[PDB]
Amino acid sequence: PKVGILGSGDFARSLATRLVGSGFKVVVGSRNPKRTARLFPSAAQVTFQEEAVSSPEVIFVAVFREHYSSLCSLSDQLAGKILVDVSNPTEQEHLQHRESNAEYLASLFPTCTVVKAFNVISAWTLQAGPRDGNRQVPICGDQPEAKRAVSEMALAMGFMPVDMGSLASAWEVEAMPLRL
Template sequence: MPDLMARPLIPGGSEGRGSCLEASMSDPRNPVIGILGTGDFSRSLAKRLMAAGYQVVVGSRTPKRFVALFPEEAEVTTQMEAASQADLVFVAVYPEHHSTLVSLKATLAGKTLVDVSNGLRLNRDGPSNAELLADYFPESIVVKGFNTISAWTLQMGPRDGNRQVFLCGNSQKAKDSVKQVCCRMGFIPVDMGLLSSSLEIENLPLYLFPSWRIPILCTLSLFAFFYIY
């Protein structure tokens, strides 16, 4: 079990409030938030970000297919256009599809990329998904985070232990900007240090729920079957 599991869920009581205050003071702007991806997580994230007062632009390879699935206030456009407009970008595509985004490398240079992906199985040796993303985009700043937050939590709002968002990255300035986003959405950012901690963060959901995977998959399959038929 990783050291992360031994740490308190709400560190130090006031640490979350302190992190939010520091983040808001370090970045008083209201950045445009980009989301690359159009799945359930992306849609829930867009709604939560807009509820927090952010302008949201969603990038898709086929924007016309998905525009009706997002709130009217969210702009659904091409990946290139979303990358151009956004100050901070959530990468919400499966890690095996990260390589399909390399055409955006120049456009995303100098911008913060938030990797929200998880693995399908425990990865003890690395590299992490976030580290691989950083290899694809060496001129961008990658922050790992939000992978322990479900689409359901984003939809319904944070509750108790679900309020924590574990973050890591090599740029403190980039992490502070992501912390501010966390706080405005009602979450508590927990800084786990450098990007080398991302493997530990990615493994956390699998440590917590290893025996739930088969029941969850069965439930989702049955739900999909009855929904379709």
């Protein structure tokens, strides 16, 4: 309660399903909430981006890297919040960009704290799996409190968080293969 999600896609929608099933209150920020709401779990509140980010302490950024900067107008509402970078870049993206997606996201929102998590977990594993016991999510980032909040949430969702250290480890974590 309340956990935030920015995005409207398969991953957003699977995250929301897992969070709702794990007893969290979920608020989703979408550009087209009317259309997006129809497919999302009823227990999730799908709303406009600016309204979705205002309440939660932890916000999953479930959009592609190319659309990160499109969230910049939310900066004032997001200040001091935890942002979770869940992105699973392609091999080419990984090698093309000097910084990790997580670090790029941190640079866009310097008043937020970024945690890398959930990139190795498939959308269907969120929906169906993992199952409520046993499957490892690598976590990093620069703030201990933020990492613990996301780790506890990972635990509540049935995953097993694995601390990979500071946000500088996000690049290596982003190379880890999607399972499976």
